Fold 2-dehydro-3-deoxyphosphooctonate aldolase.
Amino acid sequence: EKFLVIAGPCAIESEELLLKVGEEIKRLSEKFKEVEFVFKSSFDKANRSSIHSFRGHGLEYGVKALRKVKEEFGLKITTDIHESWQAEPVAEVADIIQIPAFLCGQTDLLLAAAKTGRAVNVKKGQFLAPWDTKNVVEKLKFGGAKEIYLTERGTTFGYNNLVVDFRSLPIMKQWAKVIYDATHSVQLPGGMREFIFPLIRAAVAVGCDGVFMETHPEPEKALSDASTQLPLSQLEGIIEAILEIREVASKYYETI
Amino acid sequence: KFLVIAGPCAIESEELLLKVGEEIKRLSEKFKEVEFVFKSSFDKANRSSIHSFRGHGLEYGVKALRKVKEEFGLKITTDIHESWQAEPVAEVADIIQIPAFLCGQTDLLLAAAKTGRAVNVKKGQFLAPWDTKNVVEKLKFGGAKEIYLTERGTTFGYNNLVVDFRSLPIMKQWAKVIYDATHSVQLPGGMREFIFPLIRAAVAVGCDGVFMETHPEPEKALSDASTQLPLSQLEGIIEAILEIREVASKYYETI
Amino acid sequence: EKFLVIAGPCAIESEELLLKVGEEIKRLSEKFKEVEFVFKSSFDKANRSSIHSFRGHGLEYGVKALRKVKEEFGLKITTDIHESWQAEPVAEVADIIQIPAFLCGQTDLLLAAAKTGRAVNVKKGQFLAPWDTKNVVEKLKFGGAKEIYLTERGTTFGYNNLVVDFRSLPIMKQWAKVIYDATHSVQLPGGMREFIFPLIRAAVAVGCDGVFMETHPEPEKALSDASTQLPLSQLEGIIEAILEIREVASKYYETI
Amino acid sequence: KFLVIAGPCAIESEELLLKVGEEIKRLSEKFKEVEFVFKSSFDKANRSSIHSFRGHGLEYGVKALRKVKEEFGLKITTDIHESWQAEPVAEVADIIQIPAFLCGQTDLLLAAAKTGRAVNVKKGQFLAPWDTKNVVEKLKFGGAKEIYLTERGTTFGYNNLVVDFRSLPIMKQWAKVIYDATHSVQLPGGMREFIFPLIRAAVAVGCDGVFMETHPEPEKALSDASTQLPLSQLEGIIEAILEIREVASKYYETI
C-alpha cells in the first residue's frame, strides 16, 4: 500500500518559508512515487512553554499560506486545530485535520474535526496507554470520521524525557493506521537530533503506515523546535533509507 | 487561611448540588478558620467513552452553581474547556479551574486571567514541578493575581499515577499549592483506600489547601464513582487534616 | 508500639567516626525512650558507580568496629551483607541483617540471612512493585525469619531519578513491618537534602513502623553519600518532629 | 561478526541442552557469517517464588554445558550469581554473563574479568544507558578485554518494561551491544507477540548481536515459559534479521 510521509516546517513562520520547503517536497514526491506526501505546518503553537515564544501569524494567514502551497504544488495539506470552532475554517484547505497530543481526549474537538468529512490524525497523548486509543477512534467514528490515523510521538518517562515504546505500533494498528512522529519523540519536554534517524529506522522495521517529520531549511534559525527540525537537505536521504528498510522488513510484518 | 475545595465531580442535577452544598455549608460554619470553596463540573469534556455522562450544559451548570452560592453563601469553582467559556463562568465562579490536560493551552489561561477571577491550574500528569513556573507567568502576563497550582499525580508507566510530594515545596515558590486527594489515586484509562493516607502526607509536607470530590452515594455517581468520598466521611477527614496541620505546620520550610 | 529509628554514618570510614555518631545516638536513646534505636553503617559499599570510589576497610574490621559500638553504648546493630557467606560472620554482631535493594530478590542471600536467627530488613528494589514484596517475605519465613522488615527507599522514575509512592507503605504493611529510608529516597542514581525532612514528615503522617536515616558529623566530608547524609546536629530535631507528627496522626492510621 | 546468543532459559536437563544444541549447531553451519553462542542458566537465582524451579546445581550445569561444547563445538555462555562461581564457570564459558540485578556488584564484575574470559553484562532495569560507562571501566580495571552490554528493557511503572532504543547507540560508545529479545518484553512480577517486532527494530537501529531464549516446547518450560521462542521458529527469525541488517547497516551511525 502507499506509504505516507507527513513533512514540513514546524510553524508557519512566513508564506515564503512554506513555498521553499514545499518546493523540495514537490520534487521528492516526483521521485518517490510510491509515497503519498502531505505538507504540514501549524498556523499556531498553542502551548509554547513561555508566554514570550513565537506562536504564529493567526489562523486566517495560516490557512491562506497553506492554500498557496496546495495551489502552487498540488500537495495535500495537514495542520492542527486547538478549539472546536477552528475545524470548519481549517477543513477548507486541510486534507487531514491533526489533533494535538494534549487534546487527544477532548470529545468536542474530536467531534468537530470528524464532521468536516476530512481525514483525522490524532497525536497520542504522552500520558496515554496504547490500548486506550481505542476509544479515541470510537469517538471519531461516532462523529463521522472514515479515515483515521493515530500518531506515536513518545510517552512520559520521568521528568523532561520521553520514551518510544514500539509495542504501541502493532497495538494501535488494530483500530487505525499508524504514523510515527520522528521529530517530537526525541524532544525533551520543558531534544536530541542524533536519535531522529535511528528511531525512524526502528519504526519502519517494526511496521507503520507512515512517518511524520518536521523539516526546515535552517533548523538553528527556526522559531520553534530548532533543535529537532531536520535540515531540508537531509529529507531525501531519510526517505530513501526508510523505504529500503521498509521493503526488506515488509514480508515479516505481522497481520492484525 | 487553609483552603478546602469540595463537591460532587459532575453537576448531575442542581438537586445533588444543593444536598452536598448543605453539608459543606454546615462544615463551613463548624470550621471557621477554613475557607470552603464549592466545586462541581458542568461538563466532563474528556470521558474515555463517547457513551458516558458529560453533563447538562454550561448554562444549566452555571445556574445550579448560582443557586448553591445564593442559597448557602459559598464560594464557587468549576473548570472550563475552551476560551469562550471563561467569561460566562466567571459570573459565578470565584475561582476558575484549568483542567490538567489543558494546563499548557495559552489562550485558555489568558481567557481565565482576563475575567479578573482567581485561577486554579491542575498540574498536567506530563508536567515536571519546576515547569509550572511558566504556567504561572502566563497567568500573570494575562493579569491574574490570585493563582493556585494543584498537585494531582504524575504519569507512572501505563494506567497509573504517582504523587511525587517533592512537587509541593517546589511549586510553592511561585503559587499557592492545592493537593487533589481524589484524582491522584485514580488509575487512568483508582483505590479509595489510599485517599486518606495521601491526604495526611500532603498536610504533613505542607500545602495551602486540599481538593476533594465527595458524593452522597459515590456508588451511584455518574463520574468518578470509584473515587468520590461519601459525604458523611468528609467531616472526620477535615478535622484530621486540621489537627495534623496544626502540629506539622511548625516545620514547614520557608517558601 | 515502639517506633524504630535506624541511624548511623553511611560507611564505616573508621572506628572513630562510629563512636562519635554512636555517642550522639546513645544520648538520644536516653531522651526518646519511646523509640528503639538501631546503629547502622556498612562495612562495604559493594556497588559504588566508580571503581575508584571508597568501598570500606573490609568485613573483619567493620564487624569489629560495630562490636565496639554495641559494647561501648549498649546499642543494637545493623549492617548489610552482599553474598551468602557474609551472613554468619555478620550475624555475630548485627541484631538486624540488612539486604540491599539490588539484591532483594537473591534467594540464597535471603535464606542465608534468615537461618542466622537474626532480624532481617530488606530494602525494596527500585524496580520492585509494592505488592511483589509479598514473595520476598514468604522466602524469608521459609528460611526461618521470625522478625522481618521491608524498607521503602524509592522507585525508578525515568533516568537518574527516584520517586516515593507512599501507597507502598499500607500495601507492604499487610505482610511485614515497614521502614521509610529518608536518605536514599531523595538521592539521584548515577540527591537533594532539601527534600529529606518533608518526605519524612509524609511517611509518618501516612504511617510506618520506623525511619532509616544516614547521619554524619560533617556530611560534606563523608566518603559516601555526602550530599544526602544528615548533619548529626539535626538528628534530634528530626526525631522529635516525627514523633510529634506520628502522635497526632496515629488515631487515623488504618488497620490492615 | 554478528553475534547470536541463544538456548533454553534454564538447564532443565542436559538432554534438553543437547536437543537445542543440535539445532543451533545446524544453524551455525547454515549461517557461517554469524557467531553462535549457546546460552543456558545453571541456576535461576531470583525466581519470584521460593517454590519455583531454580536448577540442578552449578556442577551438573557446568557438565551439561561441557557436553554441548564437546558434542557440537559451540561456544558457551552462562550467568554467575556470586563471585566464587566465576572461576569454575570460566572453565567452560567462553563468555561470562552478569545478571541484570547484579550489574553493579563490583566484586562479581572483577571476579568475572579475572578469569580472562569475555564478559557480557545485562543492563540493569534501573540503569541509564550513559551509566554503563562505569560498569565497563570496572571490567577494564579488572583486566577484561572483550566486553558486551546487553539491552533488556527499563523499569516503566510497575510490572512493565520498555525498550528505549536510544540506548543502543549510547552504549556502543564503550562496548559491543547485544539486544535481549526475550526478557525485554516480559512483565516483571510478557507478550511473545512483541518479540519479533522489537528484534527487527534492534537490527534496524544497529547492534552487534542478538540474545534469544528458545525452547522445543516453550509451554512446558520450567522458566520463562511465556517468552521462550519455539525452536522451530529460530531459523526464520535469524534469516530475517540478517536480511534487515544487510540493508540497514548502510545507515548505522559511526560508533
Q: What stands out?
A: Helices of chain B lie at 14-30, 58-72, 86-90, 106-114, 133-141, 167-171, 195-205, 234-248.
